């Protein structure tokens, strides 16, 4: 089929992932765990010593770390430092599928000059992924400045009236006619999954 | 006591003769009066009743009276995202001028083509205050906010396609951009924005 | 710089003569232009002004210009749930073809009668991308998503009975289906979906 | 009357259920406890040793476990493993009322072939109960494929934009013209109650 | 394979001739067909096209075909809160009868005057199923639910004053009443309620 | 003026109420504390030994318990046992203001016969106060059966789709033409305050 | 049994002849009847049918019958925020008078110019009950509530600009003001407010 | 530039603020920390002993406390004592930027006479800042009584139907034609930032 396996680390218990990981990882393409608790990564180190963990990403993969299967790369960009978790969740997921990924972090619209410094890197990426929370303006900015496919991920980070990310989700929908397609809140996985399919062309 | 304010009438709540009954009752102070949000038909039956009255179709407002020079040399900037927001922006611009301010309009400056914003950034930054008006693309307030170090009044507009929610999303996004002096007002309320912007300009 | 894109005009924001003032001003590049979401009356007063223009009533769009061969041999699939979503789907299909793509339409493929989906599954799966369009029954994006291993752009539609919320529920359900490459766009935004789908098809 | 008794395990205190269970279970049809805390099942074992507990269902019944009062059975189907709690809450409630119930678990639309494998069992059930959370598509699928009464239960399980189950509740309402009638979020009890009445015909 | 169901057409999505093109194409099975939610003008241009067709203005539905005896001796009860819910209730009643059920209507049984409910409680309780229909006063489903030990399908209606939210509150209240067999359907969906109620009546 | 004093027990700290209670209760009409924590009632017993506490009401009054200043009484009615807290919050507040109050508890619409048993008491009360949460039908029922002023209080108690009491608030508004006026969620104080004014006529 | 209440008909739910069929059927008790929320056209076709009927255009209500003296000497106060709330307030005032109460109207008492409230505060405070009616500026209920020690029934109105949400925000703000006897009713429900206010006035 | 630096105390970790404070406070205008945890103010005292902390404001500034750079002052007014936190958050932020600020606290509409006692002070302030939560009526009152620029801040404080401050945000928007411009919930920083710009004219 070509796609690795993926589970639901937050939806399952501390060991149901490992009870089915051995029934699902019978020497096949590497495994992926999304939404894994920072504490539950320690309660499973003795069960799988050959496991790597990404604290910022809250994801863990046990197996092969593939190589670039395409000369083009995906660009993950984020406005503030508060969205770095869901950014790395998308980054390591786009890495498991076998796509080189370039990280462009802390590039909010409050400092728009920071984007034009890294615009040459963003424009030369087969797909780009915009991440935002409070006032998801970054999507509209990169959408009108980059004529390449963009995936938008809203984040639940923020305080009052952000509505746990709902008001960023509505922003990036309202600027979709610029080449932007948006997925669900905190769904860095679904963005990198779709971005991988577009990059694997 | 009056502190130098022109008179304002809500043109949508009154009938075609109730507003001319309040204009001719105020036609003695020599200070210009203003009427907001009145339809083109609400004025068409008035042109014979008020020969000394001028109407702005795009702004949907009417002002009648001798309008003297601006009270302050500073100018406020009315920034618009797309062509579909020209009504509300002109509603704010024509009412901002009536209170006695100079106003430099900066229209069609959406994020779709940000270079248009950097073209007129010098005019926007050198203004006492800036009023941002945007609809489906509520991002414009965030961009201008972080690029100007002067007060900003954001005004969402109801024009948009689906999920624009008659400008409700534009309201939330402008609210979540209160970083570098962003301040939002009600939906479509170009007047109240220019009301607050006139006091800041004439501090 | 232009990278090979046809021209697009928002037909709902302009008047009947403002769009023919922009068509004849662009009638020199020989590259076809497009106009989205213009009413049948907004075109009826134009047929004498543009003899070389064709209109799609179901799509509510107008394209004028010599349309050459497709730029890529791949084809995108426009999948529709019910007969009531034919407008938006055709809006996406006719604009997806203008950018220079082949498109194989797959209509009336609702979950009410899933066998109709398994009938044309071979055509849908062998396409470079797939655009799903659904209204009250937002489930179609979820089913096609888990059944095709190609990118999918979901487009909710406003048509529906009560609680459909002008397609708002269809938006939420398509958003909660981002498993196997599902990606949603704005309500009724068949154009923006096909805009993104054209770049993925011509990577 | 024919119906057993039922209480509100989460709405009452640790012993108000037992203070009224003896005033209400004076040797009558078996008793039922909905929404009972996993901890409070241990603080009441000494008070009623003849009590059975279902951890997955979070329900406990003290008395007779009846037999099938009708040759037909009710089918409880669920899309993912995250809805198994409210599924078993409905399953054991349909069992107390005296209806045989067939469980068809982990049958999401992401793997639609899993449903057609068990479709012969679902189609031959006097009533079926669909359970879903994220993108409640399963209801519409079974509704258009099974010409038998369907009850729909939305679940609060899920992350962003699921709105604690609200966005599944709206989905199954919008496909009611296919023989689907939907109840409240996490209300596995009300679904099995109605499904029992339909089965007891 | 068909299991004994009459044919149904969504009269709101089609044009005045598209539904008569589907009626005459089905005028060979001798099994009656049904059309829901078609306007009185959508039928007025049809009376010459279908002499063997009967229309129910209050129900906004049309049925054409030889309608035989009921399939089961049991009867379902259609309970209505106020006079303003007669349209949707009759939409459910006329479609519930077409599938081959007897139906005993119980109208104007609002909580404002609960004695009217206790008057016809004997008729309601002795029915195989009961369909409750209510608008601003969504409480009726809760009262009947706790008073009958038979399945109940609740149907909210969009009619109401402010805060009724086109029947959205009626939907929530009927949802929070799932105690004694209450089960809610979509807004105004009298058909789908009667569709489910026909299968329960003919178990 | 005639009205006792009232504070905000949940909005203030453990002793700001007592720091201002002595500046506000300089030998005047009795004092009232709304929304007081069950734990904070113990951290203040040494500061005011002449204080009475109502655990169910989560309110405490320090001073005179007045007598009926009017021969008529207010009736507080509640559908289920889960609304008894906010019911007693209204009951003891209507008692401080000097109105006799009759309690009619556990009278849901699921057992409508329980209401007609106590309808003779409800109908003879100058004001009545309906309390409800899940499916606030009780208000509409008593409103159409009692031609006397009714105050409606929605409660935050309930599970899914109750929206922390929001969906009961909308119900009792939609049946206001029957002599019903509704206040805020869990605002038993504001109901008894208004009911007192109507009774003190 | 009737306890002294006039008759009330929902004028919006019935047709132009159904309400005159209920008026002439009640034209024998000599007790006046009332009809709420009927349009000016719904009465224009009635003036010949009921010569002994009077209509209130601002209130959109019609009352027919010999109206005797007030039942109690106390008076209720109907307080209005702006000129745009005169319809609903008059709907409450004319129905409050029909039940047999004196009512002292206090109009145009918005927070924009609070001195107008302190001018007529003596009249408002000395009333048995007070009904507050406000739209976009829902603050008026909070101000009057803390300034009068008599029961208050708040009534939000649907009139407003953006974000007023057809008076939904006015409903929330009046709900969050339940401090000194504030009690809110449904949107635009001036009748139900006056229904409750008549029982409190005649305790 | 003229503006001091500001961080996000709640969005960062216990020391990321200090890891970048020394890279950002290389002997420049004073530093500002918004939304700082009451506990995290103690875990950083050994790292910066020359730091002052405002418990009510939940903000801490390390450096110069400037002097009035303009003879006019900003007025922060609040209705109840429950909004004093976000009030002091705005007060100390307007103080860092170099504006004298006058505090007018506990001035709700329930006691409107308290406002007219301090109205002479409010009217003589180049900018005023209204703070409110439950029934944000105070903004409309001061807006119609003060012909000077007003900034409105809604607070998340309150109970039922306040919707974590959402229903105050909608109130002050609906009275913007009186010279009122409103910012986000609990955003005392953004209000004082804008109020400073207006005062620095
Ligand atoms: Mg682009
Ligand atoms: Mg079916
Ligand atoms: Mg009554
Ligand atoms: Mg002012």
Swiss-Prot record, chains A, D, F, H:
Catalytic activity: deamido-NAD(+) + hydrogencarbonate = pyridinium-3,5-dicarboxylate mononucleotide + AMP + 2 H(+)
Membrane topology value: Multi-pass membrane protein
GO biological processes: 'de novo' IMP biosynthetic process
One Gene Ontology MF term: transferase activity
Membrane-spanning residues: 127-147, 161-183
Top-level taxonomic group: Bacteria
Record keywords: Cell membrane, Magnesium, Membrane, Transferase, Transmembrane, Transmembrane helix
Function: Involved in the biosynthesis of a nickel-pincer cofactor ((SCS)Ni(II) pincer complex). Carboxylates the pyridinium ring of nicotinic acid adenine dinucleotide (NaAD) and cleaves the phosphoanhydride bond to release AMP and generate pyridinium-3,5-biscarboxylic acid mononucleotide (P2CMN). LarB can hydrolyze NaAD directly or it first forms an adduct with NaAD that releases AMP and reacts with bicarbonate/CO2 to generate P2CMN. Is required for the activation of the lactate racemase LarA. May also be involved in the activation of other nickel-pincer cofactor-dependent enzymes.
Full protein name: Pyridinium-3,5-biscarboxylic acid mononucleotide synthase
